[PDB]
Symmetry: D2
Subunit: 261 residues, 4 copies
């Protein structure tokens, strides 16, 4: 079965990668980083995010696995010590796959670009004050004034979304969540304040009021977009697929990362 | 078609009720408060909540409609001025129904009681410190120390849940949301802090650590339960059905209640 | 020098107390629990709070010391292992005293009671909805609707106040801080949301709107007051005095209790 | 008496300025924008902030007055309609002055710059992750990871500080308040979370961990500083002085701006 392995690139991760490749050499496994069916990420969540984006055009054909040699490792299911066990289990395969929802971002300009996010997409201004009209299914909902906004996938809810006061949501829920960054609320300016959770097929559109340049982030990447007419958020029809070899429930994953381990 | 009408019981609501009954008298409509098919609530959200609980054994057979003569009226779809229009539309009927999810609470004792909630169920102690173990699908998630906990339905997310920092969630999502009330967090005591959103079939169990007496609220009602072994939360298989005669989207409803109207 | 020792009353705390008394027996120290000059509390912060309230009529004549045999021990400056060192240092004395500000609560009835708080005073309703008008120096500031309110001293800011989202304030600042418990905010009801910090000589008055019965807590104690006309908060002219034998800065105390130790 | 007038520069503000100058022409008043004793700002709070910074070297010799022709106008004490009344009152003078505290920011480099703030000073990274060690009076308090930090004066507490969850503090308190922007908190990273309120003479030092370039804002102005060794916050010994002609208490000012007016 075709596979590839990304590494965070420190000594520990590179050696683990070389050892797994050698172990894979003893099975019917072909290393192919053009059309892998299995993508193994060795590092932290940042390494995993880069792996996802390296293959976002073949998400339907790929199952991902994370090994944590980083610090927190939320998308990670394996410690390095279980690597040979994972080689052996991946060989002979017949594992189960689980799918998490993704967020689609569309950026339209004056005179379209689309992005897929595993954690979140955020919008801030390019220096000046950030002011957008928030339009939900063509209904004008609020005029947001503040630092910015964050639209999170379910598995992203434990990331930036959490730091912004968002809810943690189980990834079996096909939804996206919008959180505020430092909104202004006085006699003159009013936002909802609360995080908002949207189902599939709801469309959230941000429309500039004055300045039309924004800093748009998708996961680890942040780009200055100029002459923006609209930013559009919706739950993607695409999903990321994980190879799972044992039970590691999301809420236990949350417990292990935030409560104690 | 069998119907009944509850009133908040002030002069304005009673007269509106008498006028609608008289208007219904001109159609094939039978006033029946034992087995109504249509339940009209005239008042505020508290009146609507009481109407729901008055008929929680026949939720499958009933479509609800709220008229607001109260203050905020979140479950309300009609102003009093549209009552005769509603009489006429309900007559000839063939409206569409929409369903919102409900929360099931199970309270087990030493030596079972179940409740259905349209807004939320909360737990506090009976005086002493509130300490429970939070168990999610049999996995020990956290030991909660604080004032109490709140488990909200989707349509309840705009109520107590919102004041506790919870997310607002569209009611097409079959989920429940757990929020903390004033948790303690120091070197010794740790909670997740964040609201948690659970899908159908997930079970959240609260288990006492020391004191076993709790004040349990379901919507407007609050009961002291003694000798509690477990409180169990799950998304109910039952749903509340609304009669809808025009589009009034949830997010517009949220806008009208919190942003401006 | 006259002294007394309170104990949490578990085996560890009682024995430590008996050993310190025996050690004090070797100096010019007289055990007197009617008019002590030194009050030693052996336990946790709850034990310390009870010690403070046991002698709140002689705060001017007393210096307090806390020894932690409890769990967190925020008012504690000594581990049990340093008890004999403390006996010896207290003997020969000439320590320095530090003073923390206190909160005065006045409860007036239809047809006056005053309380002193080291941590905080809170107000909730006696069952029904909690609604009070908040009056600051005779200026009507807001109508608060919600679960309740909390007025904290500086040293209390790390306690209930912290769980309610309040700021942590250094106790050299003569101030009190008001935090909200789960306020309602919609089109119809509005509160400031933010914690408020008041200086000396500012008076914050809570005035009932409908129900006049409230559950008023002062530190560990909670009393049902009936027929309340007004609850009045002000920074007390009285201060609690600590005996300090070494530097243990407040911000280090905060670090040790919340960050790591 | 020497005076000058700044304008927001829209038609309404320029004409009001020309009319006040003409009215001042009828008294013993000399227009002098080099060494004014009175500085009148006509606009919003942004105009007032620019006026303050235009004369921050002569704060001891100047009393400020704000007239609001902008939107919210928190530092404003006059509506345009009261301008001639203000001309007349300023003439004959003998008003009272009130002083608000200020924040001093010191930025030290490898191989010193100081700033004065009326609202706040904030720090963010120059692109990469923001990580600083927070040192309070030479005691290492926490390692902050997140979007940034905000240090607010008392009168600044109603501004950015409020949006970040900070407490509102009366400006008679000589203090500064530190709030977090989106801190990370998991098993590995821990911050205090809560706003911190510091008295005079306490020094809060931010020390870089990896990246040494930061975006530092003081009130309306934001500068990229490179090769930073330390950012130092302390309550300034300098104060801003306001000319007050009538009672407009801070808490009423807060009420008028956030509750209703
Ligand atoms: N202010 C902020 N607060 C909180 N998160 C923020 C903030 N700004 C940006 N992010 C996040 O960064 C991500 C990019 O980096 C890779 C990742 C991830 C990551 N995913 C998750 C996840 N699903 N659940 C739990 N933890 C996660 N992580 C953990 O997030 C930490 C982030 N490293 S970080 O340096 O803290 C400021 N960070 C650059 C690590 O622990 C990592 O394990 C973006 O997708 C934002 O979600
Ligand atoms: N601290 C709290 N903060 C916020 N809500 C709280 C708190 N405590 C209890 N509740 C709530 O009360 C309900 C019982 O009363 C009837 C209802 C309702 C109600 N449903 C909703 C809803 N789905 N969406 C928006 N607003 C709603 N309302 C509005 O809630 C106000 C409540 N009246 S109230 O007096 O405020 C303290 N209240 C007794 C009214 O405006 C009403 O229209 C419980 O089911 C709790 O959800
Ligand atoms: N929801 C709440 N969240 C947070 N605190 C709450 C809440 N409700 C009430 N309180 C508090 O309880 C106090 C009475 O008890 C004694 C004390 C104290 C105490 N003082 C402090 C302090 N200055 N700084 C840091 N920690 C403190 N402590 C620590 O507070 C814990 C409290 N034990 S507790 O059981 O948690 C719900 N608690 C009864 C212990 O760790 C103790 O060391 C009241 O004066 C409220 O301030
Ligand atoms: N995310 C944020 N949330 C909240 N405030 C933020 C945020 N970012 C920056 N600031 C603030 O901006 C200031 C610079 O501008 C001038 C000012 C002021 C200003 N002072 C105050 C004050 N003492 N009390 C109450 N309101 C104030 N104002 C009101 O602040 C609004 C700000 N205009 S704004 O565009 O909102 C994002 N703003 C550029 C206006 O209403 C104004 O009247 C900085 O000193 C930050 O304090």
């Amino acid at each position: 079965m075709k596979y590839m392995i990304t590494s965070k690139g420190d000594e520990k991760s590179d050696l683990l990668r070389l050892n797994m490749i050698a172990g894979f050499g003893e099975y019917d496994m072909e290393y192919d980083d053009v059309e892998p069916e299995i993508v193994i990420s060795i590092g932290g969540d940042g390494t995993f995010l880069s792996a996802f984006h390296q293959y976002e055009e073949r998400l339907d054909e790929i199952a991902f696995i994370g090994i944590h040699t980083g610090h927190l490792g939320f998308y990670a299911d394996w410690r390095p010590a279980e690597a040979d066990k994972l080689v052996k289990l991946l060989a002979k395969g017949e594992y189960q796959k689980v799918s998490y929802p993704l967020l689609k971002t569309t950026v339209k300009y004056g005179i379209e670009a689309t992005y897929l996010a595993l954690n979140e997409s955020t919008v801030k201004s390019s220096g000046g004050p950030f002011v957008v009209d928030v339009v939900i299914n063509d209904i004008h909902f609020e005029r947001f004034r503040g630092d910015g906004l964050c639209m999170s996938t379910p598995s992203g809810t434990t990331a930036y979304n959490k730091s912004l006061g968002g809810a943690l949501m189980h990834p079996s829920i096909e939804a996206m969540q919008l959180t505020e960054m430092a909104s202004i609320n006085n006699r003159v300016y009013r936002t909802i304040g609360s995080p908002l959770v949207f189902p599939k097929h709801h469309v959230v559109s941000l429309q500039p009021v004055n300045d039309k340049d924004f800093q748009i982030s998708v996961d680890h990447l942040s780009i200055l977009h100029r002459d923006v007419q609209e930013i559009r958020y919706e739950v993607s029809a695409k999903k990321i697929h994980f190879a799972r070899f044992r039970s590691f429930p999301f809420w236990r994953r949350v417990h292990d990362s935030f409560i104690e381990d």
